[PDB]
Symmetry: C2
Subunit: 294 residues, 2 copies
């Protein structure tokens, strides 16, 4: 019933806490990977002993405790939560923290399942002491977004949904304006964090690298939404991508980079705890989850 | 603090996977006696694992039925090092004390499974629990000698065997008054069925847990590495009492799991030890169960 939880890991100087907001039970598989083969999609699910009539997407969130900061990377569904989501604050509590402890929030992008937790249902800030970072491009996009921005998206099939969600996101952006900062894409922040754009899923989707000594972790957020489908088939796309073609280009760039460098990634939506490695495997890539003893 | 638990549902049953900690094997030469370190290291690197040690989990299953609370194996207990012996802390996190346990099912009598049944004064840790073991397993360790290990990698360590055998015998003596032998031909407590998978030890017992439409197979020490011993089950494991019999059992039960697409629970594969088996000729592949939390 209570879907909250955390996992603590060490990253050199840093303490990391992986938090869960819950999960998304996606039952509409015809458009999950819009450019894919729906027979092959279900074969892959069954070859991995999973259900073939839905895909459960995790909502994994990273909390980073540095020497003087406590940083939350994304905030889950918040006001958009259903009964399977909105567990972030319970997870944070289990990890030993309350909302007032958070000093900084890094938003990877402004989708409902990432920005929803920054306010409550009266548009009041949840994290009273936190600066909130977003890319300038991401902000610029959503404050003026409309239906016609989604013509290269599977979402174009849902204009009524879009016409609901866009003003809701705009209202959140208005509420957080007094806390808002834009990433500097060319400077290290707080000694540990570097930011770069990976456009396509949204125009300003930001990937964060966390560094301590010879340890690096890349939070790639919504670059990829399925371990078993979109690593071998990155050109199949994802239902929520704002621009399918541009999202495919970013997905391929970062998968290639993760494979070439053997770097560990943290992901929003792959199975818990969302940590793993990327290898080339014709005709695409393969996700190798990190292994744990507990 | 390496303690922790995961709760899952199986039909009407509540299952809690508990950790005792982990075993850090820092020398790869002994790990898979009929393999080789170059090929082993290649597999570890190919899976982004450390290439100079292997960590083995110690996963333990707690089953809450409508009238009983069953612990399947007990971790290192009196044999614990700094990374093991966390079972009671995990049990507490899951919501239970030692006094709550009604039954313990031992898969086999190795130190990392039977060590937790007594304390260092050889007093029972679980005062209200019956303890089950296979008759063959019991009779082996009561009567074992060094020569019985001549088809084990453990034959390289006769001093260690001469310490371990009496230590295990002392535990078997302490739990004697609570000890029952499995009936391999009947369902116990409406949920449990037992069968042997000899070789790792002569009386290694595999337990099937069932409720409603669901079944889970606790295969205990059938297999010790997900990435090594599924593709190469004939490489063996350092702790197997008889390497040839253990290989045959390993291949038999991996084939059954593959053919039936059944879920297994394992003592030593990465946390939480749950997963599926697929043929990947000439061997197998482990597909860990995927979770949202
Ligand atoms: Zn998104
Ligand atoms: Zn998302
Ligand atoms: Zn054993
Ligand atoms: Zn064992």
């Amino acid at each position: 019933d209570d879907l909250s939880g955390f996992k603590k890991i060490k990253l050199g100087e840093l303490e990391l806490f992986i938090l869960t907001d819950g999960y998304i039970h996606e039952e509409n598989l015809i458009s999950f990977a819009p450019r894919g083969n729906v027979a092959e999609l279900k074969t892959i699910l069954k070859d991995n002993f999973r259900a073939d009539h839905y895909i459960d997407m995790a909502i994994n969130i990273l909390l980073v405790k540095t020497k003087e900061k406590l940083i939350l990377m994304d905030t889950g569904m918040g006001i958009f939560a259903d009964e399977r989501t909105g567990f972030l604050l319970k997870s944070l509590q289990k990890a030993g923290f309350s909302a007032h402890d958070i000093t900084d929030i890094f938003l990877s992008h402004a989708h409902p399942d990432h920005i929803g937790g920054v306010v409550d249902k009266q548009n009041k800030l949840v994290f009273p002491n936190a600066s909130i970072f977003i890319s300038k491009i991401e902000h610029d996009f959503w404050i003026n977004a409309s239906i016609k921005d989604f013509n290269n998206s599977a979402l174009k099939a849902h204009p009524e949904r879009l016409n609901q969600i866009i003003p809701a996101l705009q209202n959140i952006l208005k509420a957080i304006q007094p806390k808002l900062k834009f990433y500097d894409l060319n400077k290290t922040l707080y000694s540990h964090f570097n930011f770069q754009l990976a456009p396509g899923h949204t125009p300003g989707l930001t990937v964060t690298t966390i560094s301590s000594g010879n340890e690096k972790l890349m939070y790639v957020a919504d670059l990829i939404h399925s371990d078993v489908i979109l690593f071998p088939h990155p050109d199949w796309g994802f239902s929520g991508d704002t621009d399918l073609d541009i999202a495919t280009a970013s997905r391929k760039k970062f998968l290639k980079q993760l494979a070439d460098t053997k770097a560990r990634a943290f992901t929003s939506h792959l199975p818990w705890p969302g940590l793993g490695f990327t290898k080339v495997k014709a005709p695409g890539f393969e996700w190798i989850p990190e292994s744990f003893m507990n």
